Each structure stands twice: as C-alpha cells, then as structure tokens.
C-alpha cells in the first residue's frame, strides 16, 4: 500500500531491476524482522489475541453516539441519543483522527466511554442529485452547432484531459459557463453529451427546485449542495432553468421575493467566495437571459456566455437526417418540403414530428413511414 511511487525508467533496465531488488531486501527484512517476535515472544497469537482483548474490552451493546466537542486528553462531552449528554473518556483503539463535531461514535453500554467511531451511511440526497451513468450518445448526436461545442470542450473538457496546455501558457481555465437562447434549442441536449463525455463526478439541478417553504432552507440547501460538490472530486455542477427562481412566485414559499433574494445571495457567495474553491465546474442554462441578476453574471463568476441560435435550413436537413437515421423511411417523403414548413422550427420540433409519425405508422401496424404521415403529422405537431 503506497510502497514506492517511482516508475520513471519504463524500460528493461537494471534501474527498474535494482529498485525491486533493494525493496526485495527491505521486504524480506520486514518478514524476518517480524518473524523473530513470535519465535521468541509467542506469548499470544497477536492475530486475534490482542484483537479479542480489544473485543473483550468493548461490550456487545454498542450504543451509537454523536460528538459535540473535543478535549485532547482522551475525554470529551458526547451527546446521547436521548440527549442527556455525558463526559466520558476515549480509548486508545479509537485512532484519534477521524473525530469531528457531530460524528457518530461507538460508546460503552455501561460507562458510555468512546469505544470507536462510526462510518456514516452516506446521504439520500447525494445519490438523488448525483447522476450515475452517461445519459445518451456523444456529441455526434447533435449536429449543426460545431462552434460552441469547441467552446464547451475548451472550458470544460480540455482542462480535464490536457493540463499541460495551461501550464505552458501560465494560465488557469475559465470558471463559469452559461447557456442561453430560445427554448428547445438543445441546451440540455448538449449537457447530455457532456455527461456522456466526462469522467468527473456530475451533478445536475433544475433552477426551479431551489425554492423552499422553510425559511433559509433554500440557502441551507445551497450550502450543503456546494459542500457535496466540493467534497467529492473534479465535479461538474449543472443548473438548468435558473430564471424560474425569478419568474414564478409560489405560495408554498412563506417568504416572498425577499427570500428568493437571500437564496440568490447565498448562491452568489458560493460562486465567488473567499474560501478556497477547488475543482468544481459550473454550467448554467436557461432561456430568459435578460431577467436575472447581472451580478451573478460578472466575470469572476461567469466567464463564458454562450447563445444558441435558431437552426438554419441546411442544418435543419442534418437534424432531420439525425432524427431519421435508423428509421425505415419509405421513399415517398421529401425532407426539403419538411424543412420550409415552419420557418423557425426547433430541433425538438423535428424529433416530435418524426416520433409522432412513427406513432401514426404504428396505428396502422406498418413498418415504413410514408408522406401523408408527415402531412397529417405536422398538422398534429405545429397547428393547434
């Protein structure tokens, strides 16, 4: 376990041979070094003798406790599960480093003395807000954008994969990335390919669900959220639809906008706090970019501002080609009549038409998709 971190010749050399031969002699020295201790000091088994001596110290009714202070000379005040706290002492098999206020520990039944500490059963919300797997396909699924994708790899992926380029430059990566445009323009869709691509611990949160009914529960949820993001790894925090904190008012919130405000203040701390931040990236996305506070949008808090335009028609045919790739297209159709049907159709619109047309074929048990499928299909999708 972490015996020798050096690998640097990386060849067939007498260097890499003599490494092990040295460490060979040291590990044999450890073997026959400890071998004499039981040869001339049997006196025990030492594999379970001292171990069950510890387990003969500690009783089987192991009560579960929680720290609240520390006095260094192995005694402290520890809170009971009832609440009536004590002033017990602490053992020598307690390996006194994992002791923080509020931690779960192991106590005696009788004198309630601090026997051991307890590993904490994670947290329900960490898994809830924690994204497990890659959602879907890569960046090749998107099509048409091809410029800001270089922007997203630029601020996000390239800092991860090539931390040589910033160092030869004498520079750090940009901090904050924001995404804005018309709705249905693939804003979340790009983040799915990011969540495909990355190996970092990924988090995703809607801007709508920040708001609470309890006072300060929002900002508390923020503080523990950034706690979770920082405590894990090179992490990617995504926020969708952050305008919804400013647009809609809900009567579940006891406070009005002057609690929403305080929520945005605590978040505004967590972007640009004086504390050492660490390796957490921030991707934001919405459609109403003009509405929120520009104080969150200052450089220092967000560096990169990324608009998503409406698709041009030669990109539209590409998006049709993507959403018609694996499907049994009957050759009755022409996609170019389908392009100019709406002047300002989204990429959600194309897939809506395609999938709904597949629903129309599955009404008639068919396998291929004909022209009138699209004819009545856009009647269903667009006009209502």
Partner 1 sequence: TYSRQIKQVEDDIQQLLKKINELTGIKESDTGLAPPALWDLAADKQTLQSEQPLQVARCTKIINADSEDPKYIINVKQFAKFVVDLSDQVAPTDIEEGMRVGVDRNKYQIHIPLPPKIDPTVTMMQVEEKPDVTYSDVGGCKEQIEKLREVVETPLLHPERFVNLGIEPPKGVLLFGPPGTGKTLCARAVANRTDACFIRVIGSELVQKYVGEGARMVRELFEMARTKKACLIFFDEIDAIGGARFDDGAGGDNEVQRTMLELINQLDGFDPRGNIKVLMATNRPDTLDPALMRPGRLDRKIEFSLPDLEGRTHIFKIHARSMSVERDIRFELLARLCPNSTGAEIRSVCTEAGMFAIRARRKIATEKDFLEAVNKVIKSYAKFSATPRYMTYN
Partner 2 sequence: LLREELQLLQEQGSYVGEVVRAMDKKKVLVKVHPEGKFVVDVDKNIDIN
Ligand X SMILES: Nc1ncnc2c1ncn2[C@@H]1O[C@H](COP(=O)(O)OP(=O)(O)OP(=O)(O)O)[C@@H](O)[C@H]1O
Binding residues for ATP: 181-188
Query: Of all residues in this chain, which one has the CB nearest to ligand X in the complex?
Result: 347
CB of 123 to partner 2, least distance (A): 14
Q: Judged by CB under 5 A, which stretch of 86-94, 186-194, 258-266, 289-297 contacts Mg ion?
A: 186-194
Q: Is 327 in the site for ligand X (CB under 6 A)?
A: no
Burial 312-328 (b: 16+ CB within 10 A, else e): eeebbbbbbebbbeeee
Q: Is 79 in the site for partner 2 (CB under 8 A)?
A: no
Q: Is 197 in the site for partner 2 (CB under 8 A)?
A: no
**Residue 71's beta-bridge partner residues?**
75
Q: Give the end-to-end CA distance of the chain in Å, rounded to a whole number.
A: 67
Q: Is 256 in the site for partner 2 (CB under 8 A)?
A: no
Q: Is 347 in the site for ligand X (CB under 6 A)?
A: yes
Q: 223: closest CA among 275, 293, 188?
A: 275
Helices 257-271/217-232 angle, 10° precision: 20
User: Do 338 and 378 meet the contact criterion of CB atoms below 8 Å apart?
Assistant: yes
Q: Is 57 in the site for partner 2 (CB under 8 A)?
A: no
Q: Judged by CB under 6 A, which stretch of 25-33, 53-61, 178-186, 329-337 contacts ligand X?
A: 178-186
Q: Is 159 in the site for ligand X (CB under 6 A)?
A: no
Selection from partner 1, partner 2, Mg ion, none that 81 binds (CB < 5 to 8 A by kind) is partner 2
Whole-angstrom distance, CA of residue 319 vs CA of residue 120: 48
Whole-angstrom distance, CA of residue 206 vs CA of residue 133: 18
Among 63, 74, 188, 380, binds ligand X (CB under 6 A): 188
Q: Is 62 in the site for partner 2 (CB under 8 A)?
A: yes
Q: Is 252 in the site for partner 2 (CB under 8 A)?
A: no
Q: How many residues bind ligand X (CB under 6 A)?
A: 19
Alpha helices in 272-346 (DSSP H): 313-323, 335-339
Compute CA distances 40 → 28, 34, 35, 44, 201, whole Å: 19, 11, 9, 11, 52
Q: Judged by CB under 8 A, which stretch of 57-65, 179-187, 222-230, 251-259 contacts partner 2?
A: 57-65
38 DSSP assignment: H
Selection from Mg ion, partner 2, partner 1, none that 121 binds (CB < 5 to 8 A by kind) is partner 2
Q: Mark 359-378 with x for binding to ligand X (rule: CB under 6 A) and - for no binding.
A: --------------------
Whole-angstrom distance, CA of residue 302 vs CA of residue 283: 9
Q: Is 144 in the site for ligand X (CB under 6 A)?
A: yes
User: Do 382 and 344 meet the contact criterion of CB atoms below 8 Å apart?
Assistant: no
Q: Judged by CB under 5 A, which stretch of 68-76, 187-195, 309-317, 351-359 contacts Mg ion?
A: 187-195
Q: Is 219 in the site for ligand X (CB under 6 A)?
A: no
Q: Judged by CB under 5 A, which stretch of 41-49, 58-66, 188-196, 371-379 contacts Mg ion?
A: 188-196
Q: Is 79 in the site for Mg ion (CB under 5 A)?
A: no
User: Do 180 and 306 meet the contact criterion of CB atoms below 8 Å apart?
Assistant: yes
Report, in angstroms and rounded to the nearest whole number, the Rg of the chain calculated over CA atoms. Answer: 30
Q: Which two tokens stand for residue 10?
A: 């990386």
Residue 262 belongs to what H/E stretch?
helix 257-271
Q: Is 111 in the site for partner 2 (CB under 8 A)?
A: no
Q: Is 265 in the site for partner 2 (CB under 8 A)?
A: no
Whole-angstrom distance, CA of residue 22 vs CA of residue 18: 6
Among 66, 79, 89, 188, binds Mg ion (CB under 5 A): 188
Binding site for partner 2 (CB under 8 A): 60-64, 80-82, 106, 118, 121
């Amino acid at each position: 376990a972490s015996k020798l971190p050096l690998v640097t010749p990386h060849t067939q050399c007498r260097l890499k041979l003599l490494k092990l031969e040295r460490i060979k002699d040291y590990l044999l020295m450890e073997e026959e070094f400890i071998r004499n201790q039981e040869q001339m000091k049997p006196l025990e088994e030492k594999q379970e003798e001292e171990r069950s001596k510890v387990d003969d110290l500690r009783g089987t009714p192991m009560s579960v406790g929680t720290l609240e202070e520390i006095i260094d000379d192995n005694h402290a005040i520890v809170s009971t599960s009832v609440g009536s706290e004590h002033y017990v002492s602490i053992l020598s098999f307690v390996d006194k480093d994992l002791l923080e206020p509020g931690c779960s520990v192991l106590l005696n039944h009788k004198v309630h003395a601090v026997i051991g500490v307890l590993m904490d059963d994670t947290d329900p919300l960490v898994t809830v807000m924690k994204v497990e797997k890659a959602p879907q396909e890569t960046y090749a699924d998107i099509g048409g954008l091809d410029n800001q994708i270089q922007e997203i790899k630029e601020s996000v992926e390239l800092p991860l994969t090539h931390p040589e380029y910033y160092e030869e430059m004498g520079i750090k990566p940009p901090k904050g990335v924001i995404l804005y445009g018309p709705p249905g323009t693939g804003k979340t869709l790009l983040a799915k390919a990011v969540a495909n691509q990355t190996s970092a611990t990924f988090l995703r949160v809607v801007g709508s669900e920040l708001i609470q009914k309890y006072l300060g529960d929002g900002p508390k949820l923020v503080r523990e959220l950034f706690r979770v993001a920082e405590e894990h790894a090179p992490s990617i925090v995504f926020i969708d639809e952050i305008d919804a904190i400013g647009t809609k008012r809900y009567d579940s919130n006891s406070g009005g906008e002057r609690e929403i405000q305080r929520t945005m203040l605590e978040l505004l701390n967590q972007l640009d706090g004086f504390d050492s931040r660490g390796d957490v990236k921030v991707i934001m996305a919405t459609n109403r970019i003009e509405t929120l506070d520009p104080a969150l949008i200052r450089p220092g808090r967000i560096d990169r501002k990324i608009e998503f335009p409406l698709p041009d028609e030669k990109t539209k045919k590409r998006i049709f080609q993507i959403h018609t790739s694996r499907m049994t297209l009957a050759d009755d159709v022409t996609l170019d009549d389908l392009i100019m049907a709406k002047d300002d159709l989204s990429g959600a619109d194309i897939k809506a038409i395609c999938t709904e047309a597949g629903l129309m074929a599955l009404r008639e048990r068919r396998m291929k998709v004909t022209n009138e499928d699209f004819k009545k299909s856009k009647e269903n999708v667009l006009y209502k």
